[model samples]
Target chain A: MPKIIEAVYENGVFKPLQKVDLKEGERVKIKLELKVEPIDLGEPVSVEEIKKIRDGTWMSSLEHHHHHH
Target chain B: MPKIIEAVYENGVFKPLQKVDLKEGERVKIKLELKVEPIDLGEPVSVEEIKKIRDGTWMSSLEHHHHHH
Candidate 1:
């Protein structure tokens, strides 16, 4: 089965942030996904300051901050 | 050799999302992580409109910085 693991693409290789179950480097199909970028809306972010925009949670937090403001 | 598979922890057991190399029931050491905590920052995000944060390619697109604006 295909596994999804957090990896960082550096230099020219992918480095997993956690341990994987594979050993000895077997030929495997790997899918690379770019994770959410670092938070820096440039100028569109609310004045409260955005840490990192994601799918849930913090995204909603900004909702309260803006409405409350 | 070990194969790390994706799994979902349920009720009181961990269910692998994919196939494992174990047969019948072979005992093995398992590692668990809490992952980025769903990126919850206990704050506010947008005003009913927003979405950011991915590195280099999403849906399928390489990246830039607003940072990543």
Candidate 2:
């Protein structure tokens, strides 16, 4: 069996995230957590592209602000 | 300090992955693991798009094979 990595949630609506082992031509199963704070609306967040950020490799699409107040 | 999610790696070159809290207009810092087995070349794997797959919301880019031998 391949190794599995779990993405735990500290504070959210849904349970912790579970990521299964990935291989060529393998379907990836991603579990999303839905916990939202008072400031965050209950609306779901979009997470369409994840494979683009696998490991080691870097690209421009992964750009985002570090600090936001 | 915001909540930190650690994405541990098993059988890779770099250390476990650490994902910082993301916000609008925030620059994201991604640490890549470089561990590789005989089957895998030392070349890095690209993971450009990750934020697209948030919580609850689903999109097309998150599609992959479930079983690969």
Candidate 3:
């Protein structure tokens, strides 16, 4: 199924703000609708760093952990 | 431009998890990809109720207010 989620373009990659469940090397069609301005997540960061921020930003670790897993 | 954002389907409307800046009644193409399961934001609520939950859930009121406006 096709899922829609907010993402930020950073360092030549699009990072989704939501937890995505897809297999490794999964390929899906993407459509982009630019916001009036971009959302800067901060300075250059690693995938882990992004994940960390996402976890803390969107949902609390406790709440989210129970919701998904 | 096609922007992607996480949204919940509710009461015959798609509620975006992030703030969107689109003109009222503006039309845009939408692509849908369903999640393995749906996100339950709680009992059917009004737009304002949803907004309140979203504001509190994702970003802090202070941070989100500053980020967008």
Candidate 4:
């Protein structure tokens, strides 16, 4: 089921603004849609970087883990 | 104008077989559609990771680097 969860980012990490059902060390997949202007991710990695992209939605590490389909 | 260019992925890098007009050290934005089974990007980076993503199409560094408007 699709549900909305609030979270925040600070100091190179994401902290959930609310309580979560996941236990310590539990693995979870997430999908996110940007809600703000983009931030800088530094110089673009070469096409090599795209190849380096392993799997998942390619929506980053978290969304990468999320289930889609 | 959008054009179909033949390219290939090898060794974690995307190599375009045709010619490009970009100058050295130039940046170009690209939009890519995946055409294979999802691989594995490992664990999610949490929502924080998404926050770290800077500008453009958010379609990786190149696509992010691309001009989409």
Candidate 5:
């Protein structure tokens, strides 16, 4: 049976989170599956602000804030 | 600004889920962060069975189910 375990990679080394039995100098194939972190969309916008944006009266001037000749 | 988007890999090609603009022979660096799926622990067990296991009276025979002299 294949043993499934969690691990962390840091400082150019793989650290296993669980105990595993192995003979000295034994070789094993390693498969890497990168762990994904939750996306941060930041704080929620207020309903009033959302309504203003939907009604086209919110921060309309900010569209040119980053645009310049 | 860097464009962040979702994509899927199939047939050895990365398919973006959103529209992207590019010029002919344009090159861009790609960073990959794998998406994680929620872990499944399977069906819930009954409280009675849990109590029996805690009290040393449940599935005691299964301990030796694979053992043979």
Candidate 6:
């Protein structure tokens, strides 16, 4: 089955913003919306870094703890 | 090292829109903003499908040609 995912843009790139799996031959619909915003001059940023930030660690500590047994 | 990647939304999904590699312990920042736009009515689309459209094939035809040479 196809799952709905959210898309995010950062550091001047576009990609699938969600981490989800889909079955084969799934019917999907996409909606396109173009948004233009003023360029931000706050600071430099990276999306991969954001992923690490969200994950809260270089590796999955939860998984490590689980395997510690 | 850190790499910047693009994020895209298609078929209501968000993932790294661009294909790029990054190194470990990369310092990064994230800025969040909201955008509002009028809905589109022309057609529905999917990011994966759009990727296929851009790639123009199920698999890398270029790779096949290169390998055959």
DockQ winner: 3
Q: What is the TM-score of each candidate against the true structure?
A: 0.23, 0.15, 0.25, 0.22, 0.22, 0.17
- Per-residue CA lDDT of model 1 for B1-69, tens digit only, reads 234545443432345555554443334333443334445566676655355565775484667656543
Q: List the residue pairs that clash in candidate 5.
A: none
Model 6 segments beyond 4 Å from truth? A1-4, A8-15, A34-69, B1-69
Supply the DockQ value of model 2.
0.02
Q: Which ten residues in a row have the lowest lDDT in candidate 3 chain A?
A: A6-15
Better of 4 and 6 by DockQ: 6
Write model 5 residue lDDT over A1-69, tens digit each, in one string. Answer: 345443333333334455444433333333334346867887887577446454455554555446578
TM-score of chain A of each: 0.33, 0.19, 0.40, 0.35, 0.37, 0.26
Per-residue lDDT tens digits of candidate 6, residues A1-69?
A: 324444333443323454434432223323333356688678677677546656453655465334554
* lDDT score, candidate 5: 0.43
Q: Please report the interface RMSD of model 2 to 1 decimal.
A: 11.9
Per-residue alpha-carbon lDDT of candidate 6 for residues B1-69, written as tens digits (9 for 90 to 100): 233344433333333444534223222222222348768777676577446454445665465334553
Per-residue lDDT for B29 in model 3? Answer: 30
lDDT of 3 by residue, B1-40 (tens): 5455544433324445554654444433344554677676
CAPRI quality of model 5: incorrect
Query: Which TM-score value belongs to model 6?
Result: 0.17
Q: What is model 1's native contact fraction?
A: 0.00
Alpha carbon lDDT of residue A57, candidate 2?
67
The true-versus-predicted C-alpha distance at residue B32 of model 5, in Å, is 26
lDDT of 6: 0.40
Question: Rank by TM-score, descending?
Answer: 3, 1, 5, 4, 6, 2
Per-candidate clashes, comma-separated: 16, 31, 10, 11, 0, 21
Could you give candidate 2's per-residue lDDT for residues A1-69 as a string of tens digits? 234344433332112234334322232222333456666558688767754656786667777769878
The i-RMS of every model, in angstroms, reads: 15.2, 11.9, 11.5, 14.8, 16.2, 11.1
Q: What is the DockQ of each candidate?
A: 0.01, 0.02, 0.05, 0.01, 0.01, 0.03
TM-score (0 to 1) of chain B, per candidate? 0.39, 0.19, 0.38, 0.29, 0.35, 0.23
Compute the lDDT of residue B17 as modeled in candidate 6: 43
Comparing 1 and 3 on TM-score, the stronger one: 3
Ten-residue region with minimum lDDT total, candidate 4 chain A: A25-34
